[model samples]
Target: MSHKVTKAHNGATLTVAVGELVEIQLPSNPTTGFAWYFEGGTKESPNESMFTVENKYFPPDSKLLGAGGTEHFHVTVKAAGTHAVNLTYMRPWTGPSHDSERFTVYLKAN
Candidate 1:
């Protein structure tokens, strides 16, 4: 089976079997030029052999430009241990601004 995560799981910790996949969904508005990515943005993705990761974005229902949607992440643990999935919401731009949010989930695998 799989564990499902959403905005409600932010800052929370979860436990799952090594074979169970962690499925995460979060509200996102790429139309605003903002989206979620792993910590350190593009510079760093998850660099470990403990988990396999996949991701995608769901489009808005209205089919309009400026509409919000969801971001999806699928992760499967390859070993027994704990790790943090830190996702930051921001526009990919180089500037000093406090317009950002972060979502983190401490996952335990066994």
Candidate 2:
């Protein structure tokens, strides 16, 4: 079975099992150069990641310029009995933006 998460679930701790799928969605605006990003404790090895992750961006349904959209992240438990998943929302070119956000979660794999 799969579970869905959103910005409203920020700071949530999900206790699940291996091979379980998790869907995460958040608001994003590419026109404003602000988007969502995910990074775990791993530095540069995707193969070593404790969780399988995939991300995609969905544009506004209206398809209008300068409109906002949605960013979705797919996570599958790969390893660890418990772990941290940090999601960042910010602009790549900015330095410590006031609007920057952090969405933290503790996934406890059973």
Candidate 3:
């Protein structure tokens, strides 16, 4: 099954059984041209042996324009180890500014 970790759990550590799925959801509004980018993982090297992670974005439920949404990080635990999931929301091609946001979570798999 899948477990959800919200923004409130930021900086919190979590443990998961092998083969379990972990979903990290955070606030996002792609309409502003800012998007969340993975910082600590990859297909070949996920920063750790604990899991492989991917991201997806879901728009708000309203039909109106310029709405916000949630960014979902889907991580699949593969082995026994610990890893940190890092995400940053910023408009690409622009230099680092004070308006950017970052989120991180520590995870351990058993």
Candidate 4:
């Protein structure tokens, strides 16, 4: 089956499955500023501790999932599991911009 990522405000999903590419474009007209990475796919169980770690592949300003711009990345589903790509619409220090449309990332597998 296919799934989607959690959107901030309006939507609650971004299309993603297994063995597919995810294209996330930053909000060009962000109410706050831009989108930032909170966490990415990892072998370890997703928990509060993962917050401390910053992925080089998916880093701040990497543009993987940021606002005010666009970016892309490729992921291979290791197993059938739920993956959450943490992201936030950023600003100087305002908060997450109101997310109207859900970011639907496509994921395909055999």
**lDDT of each candidate versus the true structure:** 0.80, 0.75, 0.74, 0.36
Which one wins on TM-score?
A: 1
- TM for every model, in the order presented, reads 0.86, 0.82, 0.81, 0.34
lDDT, candidate 2, 2-28, per-residue tens: 788888988899998888878888888
Candidate 2 residue pairs that clash: none
Candidate 1 residue-wise lDDT, 1-110, digit = tens? 57789999898888888877898899999878787877677523476577777889999888988889998888777778888888888776852247568888888987
Q: Pick the winner on TM-score between candidates 2 and 4.
A: 2
Candidate 3 ranges with C-alpha deviation above 4 Å: 40-50, 95-99
Give the Cα-based TM-score of candidate 4 against the true structure: 0.34
Q: Give candidate 2 regions above 4 Å deviation.
A: 39-47, 95-99
| Candidate 3 C-alpha error for residue 80, in Å | 1.5
Per-residue lDDT tens digits for candidate 3, residues 36-110, read 776422223354356777777888888468888998888877878777777667776663456667777877876
Candidate 1 similarity to native, TM-score: 0.86
Q: Quote the positional error of residue 107 for candidate 3 in Å.
A: 1.1
Deviation (Å) of 3 in candidate 1 = 1.4
Per-residue error at 100 for model 3, in Å? Answer: 2.6
Off by over 4 Å in 1: 95-99
